[PDB]
Amino acid sequence: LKSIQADIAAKERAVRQKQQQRASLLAQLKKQEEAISEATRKLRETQNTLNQLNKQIDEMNASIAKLEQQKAAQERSLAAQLDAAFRQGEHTGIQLILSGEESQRGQRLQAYFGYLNQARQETIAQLKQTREEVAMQRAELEEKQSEQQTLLYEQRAQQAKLTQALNERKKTLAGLESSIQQGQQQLSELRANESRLRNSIARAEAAAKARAEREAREAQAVRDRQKEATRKGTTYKPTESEKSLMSRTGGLGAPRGQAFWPVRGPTLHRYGEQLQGELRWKGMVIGASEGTEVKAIADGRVILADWLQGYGLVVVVEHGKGDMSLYGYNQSALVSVGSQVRAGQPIALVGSSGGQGRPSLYFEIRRQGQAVNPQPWLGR
Amino acid sequence: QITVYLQKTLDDDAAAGVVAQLQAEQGVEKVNYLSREDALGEFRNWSGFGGALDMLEENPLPAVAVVIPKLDFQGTESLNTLRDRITQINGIDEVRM
Amino acid sequence: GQITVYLQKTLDDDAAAGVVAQLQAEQGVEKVNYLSREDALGEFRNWSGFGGALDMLEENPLPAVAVVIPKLDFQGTESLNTLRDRITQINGIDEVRMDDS
C-alpha cells in the first residue's frame, strides 16, 4: 500500500515534469525561430542596400583614379612650363620683352604675349578645377565608405543573432526529439495546434475589420461610379490605385488556376489526405530548398505574421471578401503585418519552422473562415 | 594700319574663306596673312621668350590679318569707319590700332 | 659671354658641389655662380608669373643652375666652343645655354 502510493505520485510527478519540460522547449523553439526570421529578413535587406553601395563605391574609386591620372599629368605639364620659364630668365631677365620690338612686328609680338598670358591663366585654372573635383569626389567617397561600414556593422550584429539562434535551435530540437510523443497526445497536439491557429486568424481578422470594411466600401464606390459611366453612356477610367484597391479587396474569385504558385516543387501533401489517424490535411505541402522565396498568390494585405505551434512561422494575406492565403513552415517572414502585397511578391522564405523534418511550404486558401482545397487556384 | 586677329577655331578652308572675303572690303588696299604655325615661329624667333608658347599643349595663337588701308582712307575718321566694317564679318576676334 | 648650365634634378648637395668644383677647375673659367634647387625656387617664387601655380605643385619644378663666367682672354667664339665642349661632358649637367648676344 505504501510503495504503490509512492509510485502513483512519482508517475504523475513524472508526467507533469515531461509536459512542462516539453512546453519550455517549444517556447525556446518559438523564440529561436522568431530570431532566425527577423535576422534573416534584416540580412536580406542589408545585403541588398550593400550591393547598391558597393557599386557606387566602385564607380567613385574608378572616377577618382581617372581624375588622379589627369591631376598628375596636369601637374607635370605645368611644372615643365615653370621650368622652361625659369631657364628663360622670365622671372628676372624680362628685358628681352623690351629691346626686341619693331613697328608692326612688335604690335603682333604684344598681342602674342596676351594669348600666352591667357593660355597660362587657363592652364592653372584647369589644374585648380581638377584638384577641386578630386577633393570633392574623395569627400563624397569617404561619406559612402562610412555608410558602408555602418551597414557591415549591422550585417555582423544580425549574423551574430542568426548564428546564435541557429546553434541554440539545434540543441532545442535534439531535446524535443528525446521526448517521444505517443499516438494519442500527437493527435491531441495536432487538434489543439489547428484550434490555436484558428483563434490567431480570427484575432488578426478582428484587428483588420475596420480597415477591410472601409476599403471594401471605397472599392464598391469605384465599381458603382463605373455604373453611372456604363448606364449614362460613358466609361470611367479608375486610377492605378483604385485598380489596386479593387484587386486587394475583391477576393480570390472562382478557382480557375489564375493565382501565382507560392513556390514550385513536388506536392508532398494534398488537402483531404490523411494527416494522422482521422485528421486530414487542411492545406497542401510543396517541397522546396530552405530559403526559396515564397510568393503572394494574389494582391492583398498581410494580417498575420506569427510563429504558431505545429505550423512554425505563418504569414496570412487578406484578399478581401473573407478570402485569405496562408503560408507556413517559413524560415523568415519578409513582410510585416499591415503591408500591402502584390501577386508574385516575395513574402517569406521556405523553411521548417515549428520542427518539420524537411524544408517545405505549408499553403492554405481559406474562404468563409474554412480552409478549402487550394489546388484549383494554382496556375502561373 | 589696323591689325585684326581671327578666332583660333578657323580650319584651313574657313581661313581661306576669310582671306578671300577681306580682299575688297571698303577702304582696304591689301591684307597680309600669317599662319598659326608662322605666327608661332615669329614669337619664338623675335620675342626673346624662346619656346614659351611651345610649352603649352595647344598653340595659343590665331592665324592673323594686317589691314593696310588705301591712301584716301588713312585719316582718323576713315580708319574708324573701315574698322567698323570688320565688325560685320563674324569670325574675327579682336581689332587693334 | 657667360655659359649657364642646368644640373640634373636628382643631384644632391654634394654631387652639385662636385659639378661646381669641376666647372671652376676648367681652363679659361674665372668664376662659377651656383644657385641651389632650393635657392632657384626662392628666386622664382618672388616672380608674379603663373599666379597660384607653385601652391598647386608638391615638388620643386626647377633645376640647380651654375653660371660659368669665362676669363676675358677666353671670351672669343672658339674659346667658348671648347669650354662648352668640356662643360657638356661633366656628369650631372642636363642643359648648357650660351650667352644670348
Numbering used by the authors:
A (entry chain A): 40 to 419
B (entry chain C): 110 to 206
C (entry chain B): 109 to 209
Can you provide the manuscript's text about this entry?
FtsEX is a transmembrane signaling complex that coordinates periplasmic peptidoglycan remodelling with cytoplasmic cell division events. pneumoniae, FtsEX interacts directly with peptidoglycan hydrolases such as PcsB, but in Escherichia coli, and other gram-negative bacteria, FtsEX interacts with a periplasmic intermediary, EnvC, that activates downstream amidases. EnvC is termed a “murein hydrolase activator” and has been shown to stimulate peptidoglycan hydrolysis by both AmiA and AmiB in vitro. FtsEX functions in bacterial cell division and regulates periplasmic amidases such as AmiA and AmiB via its interaction with the murein hydrolase activator, EnvC.
Here we present a 2.1 Å crystal structure of EnvC bound to the periplasmic domains of FtsX, revealing the molecular underpinnings of this interaction and the first complete structure of EnvC. Crystals of the EnvC-FtsX periplasmic domain complex belong to space group P212121 with two molecules of the FtsX periplasmic domain and one molecule of EnvC in the asymmetric unit. A groove in the surface of the LytM domain forms the amidase recruitment site which is here found to be blocked by the regulatory domain. Occupation of the amidase-binding site by the restraining arm strongly suggests that EnvC has been captured in an autoinhibited state that would necessitate a conformational change in order to bind and activate its cognate amidases. The N-terminal coiled coil domain of EnvC has a hairpin-like structure formed by a pair of antiparallel coiled coil helices (long helices I and II) that are joined by a short linker. The two interfaces are mostly hydrophobic and dominated by interactions arising from the X-lobe (residues 145 to 171) which partially wraps around each of the two long helices that make up the EnvC coiled coil. Phe158 is notable for its position at the tip of the X-lobe where it slots between the two antiparallel helices of EnvC, locking each FtsX domain in place. The set of FtsX residues contacting the two EnvC-binding sites are nearly identical for both interfaces, suggesting the same molecular surface recognizes two structurally distinct target sites—an example of dual recognition. As shown here, the FtsEX-EnvC interaction involves a single EnvC monomer locked between the two periplasmic domains via interactions with both the X-lobe and the Porter domain (2:1).
